[PDB]
Design an enzyme around this catalytic site. Structure first.
Site, short mmCIF file in Angstrom:
data_model
loop_
_atom_site.label_atom_id
_atom_site.label_comp_id
_atom_site.label_asym_id
_atom_site.label_seq_id
_atom_site.Cartn_x
_atom_site.Cartn_y
_atom_site.Cartn_z
N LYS A 159 -11.12 -14.81 -55.02
CA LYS A 159 -12.53 -14.73 -54.65
C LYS A 159 -13.02 -15.78 -53.65
O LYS A 159 -12.35 -16.03 -52.64
CB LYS A 159 -13.40 -14.71 -55.92
CG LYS A 159 -13.30 -13.38 -56.66
CD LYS A 159 -14.16 -13.31 -57.87
CE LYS A 159 -13.51 -13.95 -59.05
NZ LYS A 159 -14.12 -13.44 -60.32
N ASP A 194 -12.66 -13.04 -67.95
CA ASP A 194 -13.82 -12.17 -68.13
C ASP A 194 -13.46 -10.80 -68.71
O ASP A 194 -14.15 -10.33 -69.60
CB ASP A 194 -14.68 -12.05 -66.87
CG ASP A 194 -13.90 -11.63 -65.63
OD1 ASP A 194 -12.81 -11.05 -65.74
OD2 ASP A 194 -14.39 -11.87 -64.52
O1 LIG Z 1 -14.19 -10.99 -61.72
C1 LIG Z 1 -13.16 -10.10 -62.09
C2 LIG Z 1 -11.81 -10.58 -61.59
O2 LIG Z 1 -12.03 -11.22 -60.33
C3 LIG Z 1 -10.82 -11.66 -59.70
O3 LIG Z 1 -10.02 -10.53 -59.60
C4 LIG Z 1 -10.10 -12.67 -60.60
O4 LIG Z 1 -8.85 -13.05 -60.03
C5 LIG Z 1 -9.86 -12.05 -61.96
O5 LIG Z 1 -9.27 -13.01 -62.83
C6 LIG Z 1 -11.17 -11.56 -62.55
O6 LIG Z 1 -10.94 -10.95 -63.79
#
Ligand SMILES: OC[C@H]1O[C@H](O)[C@H](O)[C@@H](O)[C@@H]1O
Length: 444
Positions: A159, A194
């Site tokens: 991200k 998450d």
């Molecule tokens: O925000 C949702 C996802 O975002 C990105 O893919 C992160 O690497 C992952 O760990 C998370 O679950």
């Protein structure tokens, strides 16, 4: 040429986005091929889909009692919560959302983790509950190698993050240090992803929830698996474990090379962490707006948009938010109002024409249509793995929430690819990962 002629060019250029049910059957097919490789020791390190076991073996039943804190990091916004469970009634909650300074996310780790504590403290003081001792559930939205729930190691930043001093370190200890340097009595810290947190909030309500899907700033899914297959977990005792697929990384070994277009490549090339999270960049909210910008900028140099003029705004990266793709989607046939307003008002494009509006709404539709279908293939792949005949899927993320037709289309794709005898249903995770992470913390 004729406006009609110009539009037909846009169709031909954006054609590589127009995938077939057969294409998705394949992405899904290749995807499933990767997940089973990632669960294998001799083949995890050569697969893009990591399948990190979260060590959460049994999902919260609701009998959990106590009062816990819960943080949320990585998603659209930083939430600081406080949960009270007594199983009994509905878990009491209270919360806040703190904005994080752009610098905090790229500077030192201690500086970001310091900010986290700085913030939580405020909450504890204002709510008049500081000296009380707690157990914090840390929803850290990133790939981590779980060594039990309390010890989590960052594998890499995905991200918009790039804080130094975090990767390769145990995040739980980082937070625990800064918390201590702020005299906060935070006893334990369970690191939960998450998706995992979502699967938990979902299970607490629906007994049939075996998946936790996140389609927001980023995409990722977590599901309940047979702990006899999770080889990296070693010979365990409990039958199952929630696996953090971390599928955003799909394509990292060339698996989506036939379906990725040049817009996907120049968007990727110019991203924060180039070459990483290839599947996510085709699906999530942080990148979908950038796709339409890339197409546009391309269309403009081919003189197919704005008579070849590019506005100052659309020169700056992330100037075309995915949020715009929301309003733009409510446009009927002979009605490009939301598109029109976007070009002139949000992007301040100087001189705008009907063809531009028409061309731009098609660019959005193309990008957003494939996005949903891609996540849809993914769930069909999970359902093909979980294999349960009744799967409740817990969702969350701006895409699912704020986008007209997203869930509407995703579901259609999961429908053409799901096991014919599986019955499934997307159940939005209303109260977020907080209530779900807290129950998990209740054991730590
Ligand atoms: O925000 C949702 C996802 O975002 C990105 O893919 C992160 O690497 C992952 O760990 C998370 O679950």
């Amino acid at each position: 040429f004729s406006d009609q002629q110009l539009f037909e060019k846009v169709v031909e250029i954006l054609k590589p986005f127009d995938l077939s049910v057969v294409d998705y059957e394949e992405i899904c097919d290749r995807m499933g091929e990767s997940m089973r490789l990632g669960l294998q020791k001799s083949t995890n390190e050569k697969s893009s889909i990591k399948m990190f076991p979260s060590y959460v073996t049994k999902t919260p039943n609701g009998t959990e009692t106590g009062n816990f804190l819960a943080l949320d990091l990585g998603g659209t916004n930083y939430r600081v919560l406080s949960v009270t469970l007594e199983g009994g009634k509905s878990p009491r909650i209270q919360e806040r959302t703190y904005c994080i300074p752009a610098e905090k996310m790229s500077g030192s780790g201690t500086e970001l983790f310091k900010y986290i504590a700085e913030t939580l403290a405020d909450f504890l003081e204002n709510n008049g509950m500081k000296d009380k001792k707690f157990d914090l559930g840390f929803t850290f939205s990133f790939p981590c190698v779980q060594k039990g729930l309390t010890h989590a190691t960052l594998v890499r930043w995905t991200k918009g993050f790039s804080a130094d001093g975090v990767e390769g370190h145990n995040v739980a200890e980082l937070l625990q240090t800064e918390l201590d340097k702020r005299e906060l009595n935070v006893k334990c810290v369970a690191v939960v992803n998450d998706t995992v947190g979502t699967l938990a909030s979902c299970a607490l309500e629906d007994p049939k929830c075996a998946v936790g899907l996140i389609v927001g700033t980023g995409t990722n899914v977590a599901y309940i698996e047979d702990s006899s297959k999770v080889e990296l977990m070693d010979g365990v005792k409990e039958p199952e474990v929630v696996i953090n697929t971390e599928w955003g990384a799909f394509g990292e070994k060339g698996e989506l090379d036939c379906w990725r277009t040049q817009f996907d490549k120049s968007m990727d090339i110019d991203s924060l962490h180039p070459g990483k999270q290839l599947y996510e960049k085709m699906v999530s909210g942080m990148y979908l707006g950038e796709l339409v910008r890339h197409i546009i900028v391309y269309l403009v140099e081919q003189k197919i948009l704005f008579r070849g003029d590019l506005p100052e705004r659309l020169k700056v990266r992330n100037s075309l938010l995915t949020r715009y793709l929301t309003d733009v989607e409510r446009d009927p046939a002979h009605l490009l109002y939301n598109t029109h307003y976007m070009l002139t008002d949000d992007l301040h494009v100087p001189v705008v024409e009907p063809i531009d509006n028409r061309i731009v709404r098609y660019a959005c539709e193309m990008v957003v249509k494939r996005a949903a279908y891609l996540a849809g293939a993914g769930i069909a792949c999970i359902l093909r793995r979980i294999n349960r005949s009744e799967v409740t899927v817990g969702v969350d993320g701006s895409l699912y929430k704020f986008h007209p037709k997203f869930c509407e289309r995703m579901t259609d794709m999961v429908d053409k690819l799901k096991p014919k005898n599986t019955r499934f249903c997307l159940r939005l995770s209303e109260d977020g990962s907080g209530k779900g992470a807290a129950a998990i913390a209740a054991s730590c």
